[PDB]
Amino acid sequence: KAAEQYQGAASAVDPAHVVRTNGAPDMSESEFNEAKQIYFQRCAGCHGVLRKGATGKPLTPDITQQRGQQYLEALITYGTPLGMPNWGSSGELSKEQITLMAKYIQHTPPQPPEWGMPEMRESWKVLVKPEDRPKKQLNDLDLPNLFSVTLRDAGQIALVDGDSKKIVKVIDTGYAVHISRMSASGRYLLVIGRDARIDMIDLWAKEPTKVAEIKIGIEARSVESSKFKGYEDRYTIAGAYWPPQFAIMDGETLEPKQIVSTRGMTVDTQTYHPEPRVAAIIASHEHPEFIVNVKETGKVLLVNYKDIDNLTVTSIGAAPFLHDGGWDSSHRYFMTAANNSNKVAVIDSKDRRLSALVDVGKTPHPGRGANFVHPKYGPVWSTSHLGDGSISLIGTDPKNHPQYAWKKVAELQGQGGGSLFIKTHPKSSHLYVDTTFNPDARISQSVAVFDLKNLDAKYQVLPIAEWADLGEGAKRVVQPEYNKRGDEVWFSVWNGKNDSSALVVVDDKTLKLKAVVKDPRLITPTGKFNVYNTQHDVY
Amino acid sequence: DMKAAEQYQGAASAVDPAHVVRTNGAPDMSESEFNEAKQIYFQRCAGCHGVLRKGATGKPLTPDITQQRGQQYLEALITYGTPLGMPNWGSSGELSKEQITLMAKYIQHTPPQPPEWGMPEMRESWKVLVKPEDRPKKQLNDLDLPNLFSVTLRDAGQIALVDGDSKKIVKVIDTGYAVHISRMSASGRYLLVIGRDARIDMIDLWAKEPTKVAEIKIGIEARSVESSKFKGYEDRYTIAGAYWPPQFAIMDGETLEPKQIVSTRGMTVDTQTYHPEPRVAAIIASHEHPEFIVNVKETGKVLLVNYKDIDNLTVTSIGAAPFLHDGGWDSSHRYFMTAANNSNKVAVIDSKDRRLSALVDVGKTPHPGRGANFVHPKYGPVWSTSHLGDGSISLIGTDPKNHPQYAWKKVAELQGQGGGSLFIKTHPKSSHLYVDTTFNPDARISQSVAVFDLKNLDAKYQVLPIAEWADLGEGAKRVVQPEYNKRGDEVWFSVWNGKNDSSALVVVDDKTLKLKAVVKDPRLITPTGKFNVYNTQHDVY
Ligand code: DHE
Ligand code: DHE
Ligand code: HEC
Ligand code: HEC
Ligand SMILES: [C-]#N
Ligand SMILES: [C-]#N
């Protein structure tokens, strides 16, 4: 009773300022569920799970009830020119569905599940114990020249032999694998699905097999392994969209060790954000750290793993909407893109600070980027864009080229907007640029190639999809990727699930068609990751 | 712009729609009925159950659990309570049967949402009353600043500066509502006070008359404020912790300018699950590194917030035990001895090696305040704490160097008057150990304090009738917090009576245990915490 009188006083919170959420249009269970289904299928990507807004404006009841039924129906129908699709004019949704959507967004956002240690441990499985795994490579595959290709809609990945151009193994994974990363030893392949399911594959077994699996959230995109000297196969980190968090695991077994929330304050307005999605993650070579990108808040986190029991995190402020990125030629500066801010942030992994914020074109999408030595400007890092056809060249040498350090030194022009990946190699004199999401079929079905020994000359259009000889379907071409020795570039002809797809290989020295990989199992090929080039960050 | 970026994010979310739940199936209640219940909730239930009803000292009152219990179960539990900390709202006749029904219906609805409080709101509340350049260069008064006391006048929303030697009120200043604590800056010039409403006030003790130079509001609800104490950082930064929103804020220690706000929402130490309301508790400034040691309650984390580079903040998260509350330094100012009250443990944080040294098992609901340090004739240097759940006083060894066999062990135990204790106190020059019993259900015990002889710890305590000595008449007259003067010969107590009744500050001669003086004033409304300037600034306890 002592402890009851002790916590007996009134809260300092004014009850009048604590608000009841309602005044929404009545809808039955059948009507609400149909609407909720359309929301996660068509709208959550841009508006967020909690509707607080990401690429899209906030769709919370305070804002939507203010607009009213008619406004909302009209906006969902015609869309806007600033990136909001027309759901009615395009005939994607019916008048009835749009009315249900307008009604839905006026209600309190339904609550999604959380995912902590109990759920993570429950999903954790060690298929082959470390003690019972091989001691050496029991197969005769050229592992450094292997490719980890994502078979998207099939929820699988295929290991394609670089030299023979054949599928060696097809493995069951999580749904729609986003990326593939290698461990610092070059033995373990790590893949993560968008469903946040991670699979660890031992390339040393007679036939490459899965040794462990875990689910780190409801939705995720990135996975990474420790790369600092003395920490080979020590830790594995993964970043989640829902819940806004990241997880550090044991690099041998995938045992969940630490989970850290990314819910916090923004860099720009310094206000609370309930859904800061984790984007790109890159392992530092300078300090025993993981460089984690937190999107909506525009924060770059340096997560130290020297002591994972008492975690040290340095929160570097950058720019809103941090997405993808990669290392400069020297592997010290993390060049990441803050896409909706139309900027590229430079993170010094050595001095542990923001070196600069470089203004580029509309919606920069570098992937990991493309590094080469410019004849006039010295070492540069490049990126193409989704919002326009420009290619930005940024100086990456503060030591021997201060005049050009962190400056958008020059621009190149591609086929158009909708570009996703730019690529080059140390042993190559070519620069490749795709145009995957470009509204024109011909442009999206081809890639642009520049001559690094003559950047004044226009690019050469390579008819990648046409060379594949596939027939019907959108046949969008995505991601240029080189092999171990850098003499051939691979492309994915991403066609629909019920259609035929292929991987097209081009001879880098001659710009001619070298090979075409077709297989009935090659369903919806997206990302391709060459083992050597991924492990040693060769871009 | 356009169509390319629309297909790029055109794919479906990996989230299963079927798993995202719609909340309702709650009893229909009108606006007047909902607001009447919501009023009672924040007045009587929020402290223990939390603002979002996810549970703190109290169990979760989220729709999933309450709708499962049903209307009748809820009405019965709110009426009779339980023996595990849940009050009997109906049996005691505190709430009417009609109010209890409204409450039962209320907790079955989705918890209403409070506002957030970020930088726009903080800057809007930020005021510089006297600019640094316009402030004095020397002390413009004849006040004995080191021996001044900063007494909280709770319900009045004010503080009072009482001269240690004369026993008179020098100045009454308008502050935030119900000031929780007073802290001094490292220079000894500025007095920092924070209200439970999260309003901070910075007072210059060097002006003609001690006046306010700056103010700011760091949240909707708060408890702690602190200043940077590492060498080379005098008056550099001021930090404050909030209950709602779950956050802390770092400000300029000269102007109170908001620089950084950090969310404490995160994963727990025990279950490693997400918690949407981790309240900030005690904050203490490190002398070993340029850091602030912040306690995060519900998650049970002790954060080492480095302020060397305030633009790129570095935080080290140390796991301790759930329900971290109050604490203080050991005799050497190296080990932060903090209580995880509902876990019945005292955590030891090494501020030098930056790690958890131990988790000592103590009694029921430890409440140390800042604690009491003295050298035990047998066990060596110790740190003590009294309890709310029982009458025991735990003595914990704090010397790993010369007494490793006793380090981080509940070495011995002393017995007080009973439960409901809040503060234990001693001083270097003193051979006495004082312990209050503020919240003890018996009137006579709560109106008195216990005193132990440090020279002969085997002997039983002496009872000092503090409230009786005050001669105040009617009222609860609960006695709270023993605090010494700079010399260590006087021990002050607060006779915390009701706002409409008469209160007093009782001073005792430590050398003789006899009544020295009584401070009465019509402005001395609901006195609670008293902080001696020198003793607060230099952590003398
Ligand atoms: C955060 C993130 C990364 C960086 C991780 C890293 O490197 O650590 C990444 C990388 C990638 C990479 C890495 C390439 C590389 O060379 O590094 C690939 C192949 C890729 C294929 C696609 N991505 Fe990706 N991608 C997202 C997020 C991300 N993608 C999205 O949220 C988005 C906008 C919407 C979505 O529906 O997922 C999106 C669209 C796409 C696609 O449409 C692609 C072509 C097919 C798909 O499955 O969704 N993303
Ligand atoms: C977090 C916290 C601290 C440590 C801060 C620090 O040192 O940095 C503290 C310290 C304190 C101290 C510090 C004394 C010291 O010497 O260190 C005092 C005087 C004090 C007066 C009270 N506290 Fe306190 N107090 C709370 C929280 C805290 N109190 C509560 O949440 C609680 C349980 C409920 C509430 O109503 O706020 C509570 C009850 C009380 C009281 O009932 C007191 C007596 C009167 C009041 O105004 O609420 N608390
Ligand atoms: C991204 C590729 C989008 C998808 C998928 C959907 N929306 Fe969206 N929406 C998006 C943007 C970038 C904007 C901003 C518009 C602007 O011109 O600034 C919006 C806006 C809306 C709004 C209006 C908010 C307001 O102004 O009050 C609504 C009502 C809206 N969007 C609804 C919505 C629904 C229900 C969708 C799925 C069926 C949907 N959007 C998809 C971007 C994108
Ligand atoms: C702390 C000093 C309390 C105050 C003030 C209130 N409650 Fe509480 N409550 C508290 C505890 C420690 C517990 C646990 C009881 C146990 O024996 O374990 C509870 C529990 C409840 C519950 C039951 C939850 C369940 O098991 O389903 C209810 C319905 C409840 N409390 C409601 C409630 C209301 C409405 C109050 C204010 C008018 C209130 N509590 C205050 C501690 C404390
Ligand atoms: C992915 N972009
Ligand atoms: C305060 N206790």
Curated annotation (Swiss-Prot), chain B:
Binds 1 heme c group covalently per subunit. It catalyses: nitric oxide + Fe(III)-[cytochrome c] + H2O = Fe(II)-[cytochrome c] + nitrite + 2 H(+); A + NH4(+) + H2O = hydroxylamine + AH2 + H(+). Heme c binds at C45, C48, H49, R69, T82, M86. Residues 28-113 form the Cytochrome c domain. Residues 114-541 are annotated as: D1-heme domain. Its main location: periplasm. One of its GO terms (molecular function) is metal ion binding. Its cofactor is heme c; heme. Heme d1 binds at H180, R223, S224, Y243, R370, Q481. Its EC number is 1.7.2.1, 1.7.99.1. GO terms for cellular component: periplasmic space. Keywords: Electron transport, Heme, Iron, Metal-binding, Oxidoreductase, Periplasm, Signal, Transport. It is found in: Periplasm. Residues 1-27 are annotated as: N-terminal tail. Homodimer. This is Nitrite reductase. The gene is nirS.
